[PDB]
Ligand binder design. Sequence first.
Ligand SMILES: Oc1cccc(Br)c1
Ligand SMILES: Oc1cccc(Br)c1
Ligand SMILES: Oc1cccc(Br)c1
Ligand SMILES: Oc1cccc(Br)c1
Ligand code: SF4
Ligand code: SF4
Ligand code: SF4
Ligand code: SF4
Lengths: 444, 420
Amino acid sequence: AEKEKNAAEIRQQFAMTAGSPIIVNDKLERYAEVRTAFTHPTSFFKPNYKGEVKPWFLSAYDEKVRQIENGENGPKMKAKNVGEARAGRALEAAGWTLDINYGNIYPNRFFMLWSGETMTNTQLWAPVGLDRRPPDTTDPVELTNYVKFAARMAGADLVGVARLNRNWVYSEAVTIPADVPYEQSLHKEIEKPIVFKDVPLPIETDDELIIPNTCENVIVAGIAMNREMMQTAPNSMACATTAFCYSRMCMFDMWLCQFIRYMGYYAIPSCNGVGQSVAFAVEAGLGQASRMGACITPEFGPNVRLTKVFTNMPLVPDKPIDFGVTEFCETCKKCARECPSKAITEGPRTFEGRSIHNQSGKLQWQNDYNKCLGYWPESGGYCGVCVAVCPFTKGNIWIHDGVEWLIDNTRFNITEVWDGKINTYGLDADHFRDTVSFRKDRVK
Amino acid sequence: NAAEIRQQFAMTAGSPIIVNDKLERYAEVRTAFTHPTSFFKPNYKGEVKPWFLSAYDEKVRQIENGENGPKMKAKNVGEARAGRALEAAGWTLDINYGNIYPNRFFMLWSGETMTNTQLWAPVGLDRRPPDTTDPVELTNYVKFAARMAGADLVGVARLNRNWVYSEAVTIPADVPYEQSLHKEIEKPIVFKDVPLPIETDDELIIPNTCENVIVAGIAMNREMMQTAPNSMACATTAFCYSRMCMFDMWLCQFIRYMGYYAIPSCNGVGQSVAFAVEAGLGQASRMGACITPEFGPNVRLTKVFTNMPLVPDKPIDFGVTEFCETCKKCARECPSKAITEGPRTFEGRSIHNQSGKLQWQNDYNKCLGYWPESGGYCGVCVAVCPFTKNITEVWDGKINTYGLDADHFRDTVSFRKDRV
Ligand SMILES: Oc1cccc(Br)c1
Ligand SMILES: Oc1cccc(Br)c1
Ligand SMILES: Oc1cccc(Br)c1
Ligand SMILES: Oc1cccc(Br)c1
Ligand code: SF4
Ligand code: SF4
Ligand code: SF4
Ligand code: SF4
């Protein structure tokens, strides 16, 4: 008889001993956020379908407009009609409602405030004094259980804790000056150093974003995307599940930072800013890094978004997990073969960055992310084909042989999506039991 | 199968709310939360304050005394603190307990000034005429979007203006948040022949073309509500209010980007229970709540008003009225004796009730009086209701994303056949 799937048992079987799994060498240095393909001058500008050179997202806009007018849901993908094409882009656009400029990357701006003091919720609750009263709990075991329970309330499908490895914190963030209003933000972006100093609280000066030396821990959350929608990549419905999950990320950060603050600690939100989420997720045990460059989780494969919160709250670090992803990616290469831009390498991992967009000095598969971004204006979306085709994105990968869990080696249209299965937040009740949590799952 | 149950209990079309000739639209300031006769309550020291400040004083007293609720010892002070920290954090995306001020803060009646609208402006989705006017296809699209936006239940009704507040509680537009509670005002909500929802110095104006209301149910966590009137019931209440706010904003933006207008509301604009009953989410009950088949009354409500053409859902009758006629459990367990044990009438018990509709008449000033005494939002009635079926064990026990329960989550799966 088939053994009932047990996601907790799977995670226990593949748990590692303590220690960051990322292999580094001496040339590793912290990475300036401006170097990402989204922001760097060498990659920021892309032609639209008329050959006009524009900021990449404006060229992508031109393609969305063209597709709606032509009744298409993606590149050379006809929709049922113009109304369906329109609906997919309306859903995508709406999904981003709680996200600033595609990722919330500006630290201590807008939703990503490093202090709760000015928030309407903090002001309303000020008479109770929860943000002023010293912590009543300092035991890391109890704090880990409390904060993980809160994380699940706040919309995380996965949550893990690691010691903060500063190698993955950006050396300088992309941000805007404090007096710049939103409508000028994309014109007034600047770099600002992120530094660690002996100070009591996270603070921003004119010159620096200062994280306290007491900022010991990072809490990493996984926000599950919708499988049916992502499997339409590179078309519009994959864009929509991406977009909605960015707003879920923002809610998570704000909810959890407020909880931590009301417990008597400080908390720094981040979403896509501050540091490299995949590295934190690997160190916090959510999953393993992969050929495509994403964190692959046992529950969702790479079809999951990441956000993280930094804190001085005492916590128990989770153990890394090794469920064989590295060895599978070594012989799989499906994402590399299916990538429409040939951005993903078919070669071995190296320590040497492929271009300015990669951080050298850590052993990883080196992908050309300027090629990736170049496909987004061409397709009018955020692609995602690599996530969509990855065997680990399939819901059907885990089997039990009578002794232990293992990966099934056999694993290696949009109208129907609109007319088909959906549930709250795009979660899937056929698999939602996999993320149930009791105290034993939160702290050991 | 929940889809089969709901089809089995579908009624013929027609509002199931019985009214008479005396029914008039209700001024929002009359609720116990806001009315001057109910607003001020003593704290445990005998100091008269705004009721929520007196309740704050009780939360502080409980933390210092290591309690999770009235006469309910916590495991230790740390556990007491954690429950209140979770409650306070849950409210992060909600203004002044319910987002009631229309066209303020998160509840904007136009998307034009939102950061997301400005970012997306070159696509022109909010300025392009609708490409779909077919109510069937629109109902399927908007219900799919509603589920993406966090609704566990969604229904559509024609807008019955009897349940829209005659006058809203709001603040002047240029008043900063810091002075909001001190400068609340009343403002009429009126329906006129105008293209778009609009606010003047004198009126909140809803277009006469605003045909429909979309009602969402946002499920609370059962284990946490079972701790009522203690702190963890407060926490699941609070988190769902922030879920409500995000739902309203997400769905309003979707509707706007489809070429229509959309008015969010959360706890403002009109009476959610009446809308939910007319939209088929559930039936009204003795306690006054909308009882749903999936969650009983343990579900929060929000709603969005729109001119988007839609197919109204049918009201449902699964026997709630006949059950509450004999049950009376909420009324016997209510710590304030707010809930009547008598029959339904058309006559309100006090200013806080809207007369003219056949309902169980409850004393809602008695209910609110228990909140400063208990330091929370009670909820004992929701907790004890048959349809709904210690704190250390809750913190150490089962949880899942947003507090949803995988044992039951299949019941809210949705395919096109059950959307339209
Ligand atoms: O960080 C991301 C992911 C997907 C789309 C966009 Br724009 C930004
Ligand atoms: O009306 C008031 C006075 C003081 C604090 C708060 Br919160 C509200
Ligand atoms: O509408 C509500 C519900 C619960 C608490 C408070 Br304050 C307001
Ligand atoms: O930098 C720009 C210019 C015009 C529109 C948008 Br969105 C961004
Ligand atoms: S598609 Fe294959 S090679 Fe690529 S990330 Fe997934 S398992 Fe690894
Ligand atoms: S998102 Fe698309 S273009 Fe980018 S790496 Fe993945 S498959 Fe290639
Ligand atoms: S919330 Fe509590 S006091 Fe209010 S009606 Fe329900 S049981 Fe009674
Ligand atoms: S407890 Fe009984 S009388 Fe009260 S609302 Fe529930 S079913 Fe009705």
